[PDB]
Amino acid sequence: ALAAPPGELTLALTPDDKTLDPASLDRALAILAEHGILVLTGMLRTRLTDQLRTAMLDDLPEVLRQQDVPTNFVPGHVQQDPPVRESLLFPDVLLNPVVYQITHAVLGADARNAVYSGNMNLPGSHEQPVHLDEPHLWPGISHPPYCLCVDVPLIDFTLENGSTEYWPGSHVLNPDECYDERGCVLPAELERRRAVAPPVRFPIPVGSVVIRDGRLWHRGVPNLSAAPRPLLAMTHYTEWFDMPPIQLPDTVKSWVDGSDRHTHAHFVAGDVDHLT
Numbered sequence: 001a002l003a004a005p006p007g008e009l010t011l012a013l014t015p016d017d018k019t020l021d022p023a024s025l026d027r028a029l030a031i032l033a034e035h036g037i038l039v040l041t042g043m044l045r046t047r048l049t050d051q052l053r054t055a056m057l058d059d060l061p062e063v064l065r066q067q068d069v070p071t072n073f074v075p076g077h078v079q080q081d082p083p084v085r086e087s088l089l090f091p092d093v094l095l096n097p098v099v100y101q102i103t104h105a106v107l108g109a110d111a112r113n114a115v116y117s118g119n120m121n122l123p124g125s126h127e128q129p130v131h132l133d134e135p136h137l138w139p140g141i142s143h144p145p146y147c148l149c150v151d152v153p154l155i156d157f158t159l160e161n162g163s164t165e166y167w168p169g170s171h172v173l174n175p176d177e178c179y180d181e182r183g184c185v186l187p188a189e190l191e192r193r194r195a196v197a198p199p200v201r202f203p204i205p206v207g208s209v210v211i212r213d214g215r216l217w218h219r220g221v222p223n224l225s226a227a228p229r230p231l232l233a234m235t236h237y238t239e240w241f242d243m244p245p246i247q248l249p250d251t252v253k254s255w256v257d258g259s260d261r262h263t264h265a266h267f268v269a270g271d272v273d274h275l276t
């Protein structure tokens with residue numbers, strides 16, 4: 001069992017680091033190209049993650065009261081958006097300079113964030129099937145990345161509370177008849193891959209940010225703790241990939257809109273209801 005993120009996937013920062021130096025950026029990119037997953041430690045201040053964790057746990061009762069609680073694949077992996085109230089929208093989270101340095105270098109200067117969502121993994125949750133969150137664009141074709149998932153754990157993720165299983169290097173795999181309509185990986189391909197490059201799972205401390213290819217094979221797993229495990233999730237896409245805009249209150253337009261760290265946003269006059 002791993003006690004920490006593996007050194008080969010990890011770059012250590014502080015919240016004062018606003019850019020990676022050239023050698024660190026090169027390493028970040030080499031990790032993403034080879035392994036499809038990069039763990040950045042020490043990115044976000046406690047003040048921010050505390051507030052986001054508290055807001056998501058406070059919203060959970062409303063989410064659980066809905067008629068059909070929306071889940072990712074199997075019981076206990078609840079889809080839950082974080083609030084888009086002005087007081088909980090932070091430049092260092094939505095427009096993190098290190099994250100965008102990386103996504104600009106991989107996806108281009110006009111890459112844009114188009115997801116502001118989350119995954120609440122409840123106590124007693126089930127095992128998800130191995131899947132990709134975003135598909136390859138044509139079957140049987142090798143092509144470069146068009147999207148990067150930016151995952152923000154809001155508590156310490158442990159082997160006990162449902163730290164995600166990742167399949168390193170799987171982001172480039174796209175043989176024929178590999179994926180079903182839900183993005184789940186066909187069992188024959190899973191087992192062939194396992195023999196060559198087995199999956200890994202490891203603790204990730206709150207304050208970290210995980211950047212990964214949207215095509216990376218992974219699965220959520222059971223949370224065997226007594227506490228819900230919140231993840232905040234964003235996804236950067238090439239400018240040409242069609243996505244609906246993120247609904248944001250126009251009280252953040254001044255700093256969101258016109259930044260060179262792009263967001264595909266629609267700005268609204270009221271407060272936005274993130275939950276319904």
Ligand code: NI
Pocket residue numbers: 131132133218219220
């Ligand atoms: Ni997933």
